[PDB]
Structure formats: C-alpha cells, structure tokens
C-alpha cells in the first residue's frame, strides 16, 4: 500500500532464465550458468530512471537547493525526463527538459502528456550544447535548478542503495552483474556496493559500437564522458552491434516472455557471451542483469517486426 | 527471487490518488473521500490478463485437459492473447492464436513476438467466426485444447484468490471496488471476495454504451462515453502521472461519480480502481492529446 507512487518503485524482481541461460541445472558437464533478468519496467513510469530521478529530487530537496514551485531544468530526452516528469508533477515542481533539435521523436513522445516542457538546442552543438544550455538556463533564476544525472551522486547513490543492496539480498551467490552503461550510474551504483559486498564480483558494461547511432536508444554522444564514470570499477565493457541487440531483444521476448527495450538485448549479448566464457571454463556462474525497461516505447521503430536487416537501417 | 517469471504475477501495489481524489484528508468539510489505484499493468506482460491466463492453465492441467507436449488454442487476440502467449511457452505448451486474417498488425506483430503461431480465419465472421474455427480445430487432436476466457471460472478464481486478497491486504477500510466489465472476471471474482469479508462493500462496473456474470455481485454500473473516458484517462496521466489505458478512464470516471456521491452525502470513502493496463498501445489513436471529437473518431 502506497501514498504516493514515488514510493512504488525498487524492490524489483530478479527472475531466473532457466531456457536462455547457457546451462541452468549443475551437471556431469559441469556447474550451472544462470542468468538472472532484474526487471527494471516493474516501476513508477516503466524504466529504470524512477530511482535516480526521485532520488536526485529528494536530494536536492534535503540539500535545500529546491523550494516550492521550483522548475526543474535537464539536459536529457527519453527515460530520465519521463521519470523527472512524473515525479516533479507529483511534488510540485516543473520540468523543462534541454535536447538537441535532431534529437529521435521515440525519446519526446509522452514527455508533455505527463507535464513536461521542451527546449531544443542547437544539432550541431550535440549534447554537449544540450548542457551548457540548461546550466545557463538554470542561472536565469533562483527557481530554476539543475540536476545533471551525468555528475549528481544522487544517481549513483539511488542504485548503492536500492539496485545493489537488492541483488545482494536475492543472489548472493552472484558472480557477475550485467548492464547498460549511460550515464553510469547504474554500473558506478551498484559496481560500487557489490564490490564491496561480494567476493570476486565481476562488473561488465554493454554500450553500443562507436558508428553506430542507434538514435532512438542514446541520449548523448559517442566521445562524452559522464563526470560519474570511473573507470575502475568495471571488470570490463563491451561493444554490442545493432543487429546483435536487437536479435538478443526478441530473442528474450520469444523465449522467456520478457518484453524488453532494446538496451536490454545488448545487456543480455553481453551476459552471453560472459556466461559462454565461464560454460567453456568449466566455472560456476550467477549472471544477473538490468532489464532497463520494455519494449513498448520502442515498437514504432519497426525493430520488433520484419527483418534485422530493416531494424537495423531503421536505428 | 523468482525461478520463473510466471511467479512475479500478481501482488500489485495499489497506490493513493491525492491530486485526484475528491477529498483526501478528513476535513473540517467531513470525512475523506480517497481513490486507490491497483496497477495491474505491473503485471509480466503488463495487464490484468496475466491472472486468470495463469490461473486457466493450471485449472486445465488439474482437470486433465492438459498434459506433455499439449497446444492451447486461444480464438483472442487483445490482452488475453498476449497473456496466454507467455504463460504457455513457460508451461512449456506451444500455443495457437486463431484470429480475423484482418487483425491490425500491431497485435498481431505482438503476438509472433511473443511466439505466437497464428492462424487466420476470414475476416467476415469477425470474432464468432475465429472462435468457430478454433473449436474445430481442438476437436481434431486430444492434445489440442481451447480454454474458453468467458466461459471459464478460473479466470473469475483468479480474482478470488489474487485481486480481492491483496486489495483486503493493502485497504481493509475500503468501502467501494471499481473496474471493468468485460469477461467480468475481475468484478465477480473479487466483488465476491469482497463482500465475503468486508460488509456493507460496494462492487461497480464501468462499461461502454450500449459467462461468469452472476447478476447478484454489483451494487452499481456506469456506462461510460467515449469523450469521458478519453478525457480521465488524460486527467489521470497529467495529474497523477499514471500512463494508463483507455479502459482505466472508464473506470476512473464511474469511480469519480461515486466518489462526488459520496462526498455530497458527507460519507467516508475509500474507492479502490483497476488500472488495467498502460497507455502504450492506445498512443497511436492520438487519443493522449488533441481534439477530444478525434480521439471519439480515432476509437
Ligand atoms: O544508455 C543508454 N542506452 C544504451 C545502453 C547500453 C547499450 C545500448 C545499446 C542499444 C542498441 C544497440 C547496442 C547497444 C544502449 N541510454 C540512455 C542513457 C542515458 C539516459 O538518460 C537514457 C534515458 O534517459 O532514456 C538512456
Ligand atoms: O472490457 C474491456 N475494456 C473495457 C471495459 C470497460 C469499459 C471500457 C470502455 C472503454 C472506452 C470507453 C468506454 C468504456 C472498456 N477490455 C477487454 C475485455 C476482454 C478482453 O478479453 C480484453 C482483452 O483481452 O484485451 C479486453
Ligand atoms: C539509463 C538507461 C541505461 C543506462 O543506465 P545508466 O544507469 O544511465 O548507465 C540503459 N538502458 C536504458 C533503457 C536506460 O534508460
Ligand atoms: C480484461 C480487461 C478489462 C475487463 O476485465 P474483465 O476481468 O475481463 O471484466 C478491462 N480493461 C482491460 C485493459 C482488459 O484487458
Ligand atoms: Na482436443
């Protein structure tokens, strides 16, 4: 039972992938290989944004940085300014999101349905323009703040506090942990709790290739680099491939029911071939991975559909 | 911790509408009228369906209806369809979808998603004529079995044993139930659960303008137009920031009714609401903004 929505969000279910995993049952072949789906879509707005845009909120709230009727300004389109959406509406502030103006119509479509504004920055400028416009944007006016999901700490405290305590309480027999690498906070977050937490935990990042666009699925530019990213943590990243995301994305869907987005797909190529590499080695493993959100948002790329060919050209 | 995806059904939250309810704390001006959201599209496949899918299957297995290596025919294509797609494939059972050959190609895209195989039946006989033709094609082979949604009591059990648990669980103060009638599982199933345990309960449909039905259940039913169903559902994602389907604005407007009835009667109220699924799928209609008379026409 909740007061408010902002409450029901977190606690996520880890569920097992007994026919996609590389080996679920211990065996005269060798240890198990499990994959294990946190299902990031069972949420306030349907992704896993609904913990570090209320955190960040929160946050700035405790800090005193907010006051009634404050607007808030982001420098982001897509999943980020639909969770700051509802959850500004939900306290009382405003939102006016920053993006560049050649920014894919998938990543705006619901923001105005739930309360939002939109600025447009310059193409050429990229996100590093979409930035600078709402810092200075914010310094227009004492009711105007910036949060900055790409160095506020609240993003990766939402996940040292919620995602990672989680995972340790439903898999603490885990030895990898899987997931899209943005604005890192989910890999910084969590990376950070479980290495600390889990002996030998290994932290992998998928990310798309450098080349390709995949604009519907990226919120900022091939080169920038989040002031939240530390290199450190990670064990490693991989590069996934659009065909290969996107083959992972359906192939999740049509094997164990989950509708996921296709970030999800590149997530799960990596924590295949992760699951590949310990199957070959004989070695135990207990792969949990982020399912950031589902499928529907993304169906009007035509991905889901015909040939991955087509879904290919289409991103 | 879930071995099976199937088992992360069901324990919905239901969550308070403050911004939207006519009255949320007892006042000065009388006591609260409060609305609660069951958001059933927290659901596997992000609806109510996923219930009494599950629950039909088990219900067909304990009866001997399905056994190893079997296939279920649903003559469906919507929510349910989606629904059974899923639970069959982690049963382990392949599953058929016989639909119109005229089926929009957004639900039938969804349901090859899913692993549907399809069968098309002509687009003439609509739905009657797809049920017809998914009968005969189970009377060709045992293994080969229709489940039969509006017709069979697990789909009510399902709302027996999981909506009306969990709604006492998390409101023992309510005082009216409101949701959809459609197969009308979900009303009678927990409208008797309901009134089981809690007295003097309310159970209220919402239905568009002009079985499992048991004509006893309801205490109230509100037919429901286009233009306000389209106009809560609106309300209900700008104010409450819950992106929510067409069926829910029904809801939410018969839930709003009762709830001002209340309030001018000066009684307590606690109104709980089924959120039946997301806004995902009515988005194309356009429904979500703009013209309210092109949202009537878009359907
Ligand atoms: O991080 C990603 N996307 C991502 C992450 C990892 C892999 C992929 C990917 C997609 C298609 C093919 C290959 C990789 C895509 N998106 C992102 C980043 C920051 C954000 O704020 C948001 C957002 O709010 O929507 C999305
Ligand atoms: O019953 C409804 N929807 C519903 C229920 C009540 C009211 C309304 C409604 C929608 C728009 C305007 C007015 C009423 C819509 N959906 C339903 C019923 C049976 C089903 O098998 C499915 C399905 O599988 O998708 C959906
Ligand atoms: C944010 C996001 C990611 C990346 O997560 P970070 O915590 O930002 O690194 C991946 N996929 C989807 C759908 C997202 O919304
Ligand atoms: C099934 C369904 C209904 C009606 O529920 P019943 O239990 O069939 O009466 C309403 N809305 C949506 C979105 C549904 O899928
Ligand atoms: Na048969």
């Not at 209320?54 to 980020?80: F, K």
């Not at 699925?217 to 490693?236: C, H, K, Q, S, W």
């Amino acid at each position: 039972r909740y007061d408010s929505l902002l409450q029901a969000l977190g606690n996520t279910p880890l569920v097992g992938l007994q026919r996609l995993s590389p080996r679920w049952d211990d065996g005269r072949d060798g240890p198990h290989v499990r994959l294990w789906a946190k299902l990031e879509d069972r949420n306030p707005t349907g992704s896993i944004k609904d913990r570090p845009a209320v955190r960040m909120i929160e946050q700035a709230e405790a800090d005193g940085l907010l006051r009634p009727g404050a607007t808030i300004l982001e420098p982001t389109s897509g999943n980020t300014g639909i969770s700051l959406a509802m959850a500004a509406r939900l306290k009382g502030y405003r939102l006016i999101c920053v993006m560049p103006e050649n920014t894919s119509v998938e990543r705006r479509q619901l923001l105005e349905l739930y309360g939002a504004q939109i600025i447009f920055s310059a193409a050429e400028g990229g996100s590093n323009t979409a930035v600078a416009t709402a810092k200075e944007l914010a310094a227009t006016n004492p009711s105007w703040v910036m949060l900055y999901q790409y160095g506020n700490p609240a993003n990766t405290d939402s996940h040292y506090c919620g995602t990672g305590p989680e995972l340790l309480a439903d898999l603490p027999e885990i030895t990898h942990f899987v997931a899209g690498l943005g604005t890192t906070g989910t890999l910084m977050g969590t990376g950070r709790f479980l290495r600390e937490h889990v002996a030998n935990v290994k932290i992998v990042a998928a990310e798309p290739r450098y080349g390709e666009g995949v604009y519907a699925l990226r919120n900022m530019d091939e080169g920038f680099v989040p002031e939240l990213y530390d290199p450190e943590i990670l064990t490693a990243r991989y590069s996934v491939g659009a065909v290969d995301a996107v083959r992972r994305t359906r192939e999740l869907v049509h094997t164990e029911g989950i509708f996921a987005g296709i970030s999800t797909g590149a997530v799960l190529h990596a924590a295949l071939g992760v699951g590949a590499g310990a199957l070959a080695a004989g070695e135990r493993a207990d792969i949990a991975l982020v399912v950031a959100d589902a499928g529907w948002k993304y169906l009007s790329t035509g991905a889901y559909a015909g040939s991955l060919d087509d879904a290919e050209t289409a991103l």
